[PDB]
Write an enzyme that holds these catalytic residues in place. Structure first.
Site, mmCIF file in Angstrom:
data_model
loop_
_atom_site.group_PDB
_atom_site.id
_atom_site.type_symbol
_atom_site.label_atom_id
_atom_site.label_comp_id
_atom_site.label_asym_id
_atom_site.label_seq_id
_atom_site.Cartn_x
_atom_site.Cartn_y
_atom_site.Cartn_z
ATOM 1 N N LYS A 150 -12.501 63.021 -7.538
ATOM 2 C CA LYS A 150 -12.329 62.436 -6.213
ATOM 3 C C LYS A 150 -12.136 63.579 -5.230
ATOM 4 O O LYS A 150 -11.056 64.169 -5.153
ATOM 5 C CB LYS A 150 -11.134 61.492 -6.176
ATOM 6 C CG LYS A 150 -11.282 60.231 -6.990
ATOM 7 C CD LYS A 150 -10.084 59.324 -6.766
ATOM 8 C CE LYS A 150 -10.204 58.019 -7.536
ATOM 9 N NZ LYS A 150 -9.026 57.140 -7.294
ATOM 10 N N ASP A 189 -2.428 44.450 -1.840
ATOM 11 C CA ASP A 189 -3.820 44.220 -2.218
ATOM 12 C C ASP A 189 -3.873 44.123 -3.740
ATOM 13 O O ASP A 189 -4.267 45.053 -4.444
ATOM 14 C CB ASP A 189 -4.727 45.326 -1.694
ATOM 15 C CG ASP A 189 -6.187 44.930 -1.722
ATOM 16 O OD1 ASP A 189 -6.468 43.742 -1.983
ATOM 17 O OD2 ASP A 189 -7.051 45.805 -1.527
#
Lengths: 197, 271
Positions: free
Chosen positions: B111, B198
């Site tokens: 990432k 979430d």
RNA sequence: GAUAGUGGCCUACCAUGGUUUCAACGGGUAACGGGGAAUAAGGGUUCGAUUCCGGAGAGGGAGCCUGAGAAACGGCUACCACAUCCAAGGAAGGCAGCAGGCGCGCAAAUUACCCAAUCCUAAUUCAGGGAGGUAGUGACAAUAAAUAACGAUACAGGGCCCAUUCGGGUCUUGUAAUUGGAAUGAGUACAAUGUAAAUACCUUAACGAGGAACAAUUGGAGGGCAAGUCUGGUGCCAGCAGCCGC
RNA sequence: GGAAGGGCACCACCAGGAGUGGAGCCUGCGGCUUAAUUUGACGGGGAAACUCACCAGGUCCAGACACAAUAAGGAUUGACAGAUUGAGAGCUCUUUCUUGAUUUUGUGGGUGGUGGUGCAUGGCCGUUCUUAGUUGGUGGAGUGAUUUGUCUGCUU
RNA sequence: UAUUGCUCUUCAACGAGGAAUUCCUAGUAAGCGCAAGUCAUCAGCUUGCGUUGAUUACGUCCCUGCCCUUUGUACACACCGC
RNA sequence: AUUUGGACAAACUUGGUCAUUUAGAGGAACUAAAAGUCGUAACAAGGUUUCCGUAGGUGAACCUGCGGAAGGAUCAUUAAA
């Protein structure tokens, strides 16, 4: 199977110190010397007042091989080529040995990695890298090529110096693969006749 | 070693001032002649690893996003990490996710963070460090989560996990224990002091080991949404987590809860 | 008293003086003093072992004979330090004179000829003189100044006036390892001069150059500071080095 | 100078509307794979042939002039039909024959620059800064560099 | 590896959709189709046309930025520990 | 020949003192065109009115007493013209 001495200069000076420690009879003396000498070489014992017969002493392990490095500059008005593969007799110390030396360039390498030349360089000084026994005196060296055609049995290729007993000095042959950039889509170029497969 | 060391030196010639002129990259490197410094800077600029800002009477050198990661690769050459680079699975907002491999040959996840001159780099650095510390907190508490390998100043290299999201998962056989799991895990979140608002279908990742032993786990990736219980609005955040689990299990798995689900007032006697 | 002779020069007896910031005394000198040398508009700065004058010394100290004159070293005596011969008992020694050797060091010449000059010494016109002169070695400095000079051709120009156009001459270049006839010493050398004898110089019979080699070198060509916008190699011994350096 | 102040915009926010990202599929990019998945960052790049710029193969046609040989009883160039011929088309030799130096072979400076990339010159389709505040002419005062114009205010 | 059109049959995910993202103030949005170029055959490609026709602002620089300026300034490059 | 006493006075020995040539032997410290190791290299940054005298504690650094200097950026506000 080579004698690997680490640093030539310091070990050389230390062995000279050891030799001066071990000088059993000094210069200015007269000696009845008994040398180990075989029977069959008595046929070359000549009249000593008629043939010069000198006796030179040696040092520790100057008989054992190392990768030793000689300097070499071309003899003057000697325009004849010589490769890194011909047998050539080298005078260093007192000993004249037939050597097939690797001709290298002595320009300083941090990793001690050098080039291999095919021939002797015609302009500057090269280094003769060869399996040969060691000197401890940094004697002058003279390189020649034995020939009975000349008056002397010697063709003088040059002179030089016993530089080092260095085994890390290694050599490399370059091979260049070449092609012609035929057509220009200016960045991505088609190059013609370098490889075939 | 040497060229990477000098590139690390001009990396360390960034944490001195603002936008760095030419002679500082000449002298911080401390190299021999005009050759190494100037031809290195030209190799940077032609690979877009550096840029020229010429503000009046003043040359300066502007580092973009390109000429950093090599040093991170060098930083990851130090820490036994990735050798081969590039397979695109997921271009996110605050990171770009790639599939990479080490010298050992195991695929990993790279990432890179892109969040110029100092602040893009430095905020990507703060984001990577913050996410690495949050991953460390989750693994230290014992949450089933991917194991971090390293956080190469602004690029996070971690493991790959064989999972697929729950939107393509029809059901399992042990549905009420899965509901008790996805209730008790949000209970464990409230017992940590946090609420992951979430908690959707795309978050929850299931690894599938076998069909007989049933020794599997979960992976929860909700990092810019976890909110402490002390904040103003955590009540219906917790309730949205619970009720998204319940409405998914009613819609997809067709499962209604027989035990009543936990409230925020239920979990106020937790941590 | 001693001396050639005054004089604390020394001795006996008395006094308690003498020198000093106007620098005594002590210390250093890679300090023999001067006439002079180098360098400047002036004023100054720095050298002077060294050709003339004076001083001092002859390995270091000391003492003395002779004589008008020496505290003499090509005179003596003793010690100290070196050093020579020796049959071991003894015996000789002073190159900071001319040559020459070792050592030392960046650093310095021939173990030649001569009293013909210039002078000096003696019993003296005559003898003697490494004083001195001569030659060798000598790029210590200093003076003078060979390594080429004329033509004709062409060819390329330029200029001067006549150009209406050609061409009519005056120059001056450039080249063409194109051509021509000249001049002369470096060198060799009969002779003569020279000189104590010579060598060399000044003269001079006879030779002695197109000189594609009787071959001029030493340092440079970024700036200071005259001179490259030239080519090749380098660019692993290389942006490099009185200074700045690119 | 990491001071603050205004525009002034739904490629910004608030009032919302339609939404995308959620499902399936069309289509563009990346990645993988390949023998090729030609190649750029919509390329008028809509698409079995073409377009095709990529692969598996099979093929023609090269090359001027000079120059040493070779000659019309024959160098050879073409109209052929058959043996062909593998997937197709070419290609070779047996005649019916034109043959006619267009020779054929091997070379030497390069014709060929329909082999081209660089040096100059002239110049051009999309342009674009579609110049919405600046310039210079001086003045003066300051060794240079600089002040003013280019301003206290007010206003568009 | 079906260009496409027609007939019957087979009837999958998909119960208003996450992190995040786009465009927009009147016949505009949105819904709709048609026509023209790509067109040998088809669009889910692009452009114009017309039919039906909302909600809600007409405010802001608070986010996003974009500039426009004002000038505190260069430490005119200083010391260090390192 | 020998010999007394004088002045001149070279030298010699003994100590003790400086000034040295040394040789050796004992120790200590500086360096690397040397080579590898850990500590803060592959580490974070941090302090920043500046000085002068004196005293103290210190630590890798530097702070705190007492007294001086500016070698530190005077706006407004009373009056004047």
């Amino acid at each position: 199977r080579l004698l690997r001495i680490g640093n030539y200069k310091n070990t050389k000076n230390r062995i000279i110190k050891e030799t001066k420690n071990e000088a059993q009879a000094i210069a200015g003396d007269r000696i009845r010397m008994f040398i180990r000498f075989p029977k069959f070489l008595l046929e070359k014992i000549q009249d000593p007042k008629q043939l010069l017969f000198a006796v030179y002493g040696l040092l520790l392990h100057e008989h054992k091989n190392a990768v030793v490095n000689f300097s070499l500059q071309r003899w003057e008005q000697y325009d004849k080529p010589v490769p890194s593969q011909e047998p050539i007799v080298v005078q260093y110390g007192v000993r004249r040995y037939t050597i097939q030396p690797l001709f290298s360039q002595g320009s300083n390498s941090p990793n001690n990695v050098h080039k291999y030349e095919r021939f002797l360089h015609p302009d500057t000084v090269s280094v003769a890298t060869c399996i040969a026994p060691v000197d401890f005196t940094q004697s002058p060296a003279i390189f020649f090529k034995p020939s009975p055609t000349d008056a002397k049995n010697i063709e003088l290729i040059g002179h030089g110096t016993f530089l080092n007993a260095d085994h890390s000095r290694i050599l490399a042959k370059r091979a260049i693969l070449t092609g012609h950039p035929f057509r220009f889509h200016k960045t991505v170029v088609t190059v013609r006749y370098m490889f075939f497969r | 070693t040497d060229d990477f060391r000098v590139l690390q030196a001009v990396e360390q010639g960034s944490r001195s001032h603002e936008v760095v002129p030419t002679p500082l990259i000449h002298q911080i490197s401390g190299m021999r002649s005009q050759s190494g410094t100037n031809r290195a800077i030209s190799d940077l600029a032609k690979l877009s690893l550096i840029s020229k800002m010429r503000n009046v009477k003043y040359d300066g050198y502007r580092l973009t996003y390109n000429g950093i990661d090599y040093l991170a690769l060098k930083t990851m050459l130090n820490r036994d990490t990735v050798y081969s680079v590039g397979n695109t699975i997921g271009v996110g907002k605050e990171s770009d996710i790639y599939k990479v491999s080490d010298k050992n040959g195991n695929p990993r996840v790279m990432k890179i963070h892109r969040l110029q001159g100092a602040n893009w780099m430095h905020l990507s650095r703060l984001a990577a460090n913050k996410e690495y510390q949050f991953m460390s907190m989750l693994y230290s508490k014992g949450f089933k989560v991917p194991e971090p390998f390293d956080n190469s100043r602004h690029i996070v290299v971690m493991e790959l996990i064989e999972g697929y999201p729950m939107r393509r998962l029809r059901k399992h056989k042990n549905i009420p224990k899965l509901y008790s799991d996805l209730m008790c895990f949000i209970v464990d979140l409230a017992n940590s002091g946090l609420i992951h608002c979430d908690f959707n279908e795309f978050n929850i990742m299931i690894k599938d080991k076998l069909e007989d032993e049933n020794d599997c786990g979960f992976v929860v990736i909700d990092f810019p949404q976890c909110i402490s219980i002390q904040h103003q609005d955590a009540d219906y955040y917790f309730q949205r987590d619970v009720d998204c689990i319940r409405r998914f299990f009613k819609k997809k798995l067709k499962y209604e809860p027989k035990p009543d689900s936990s409230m925020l007032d239920t979990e106020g006697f937790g941590d």
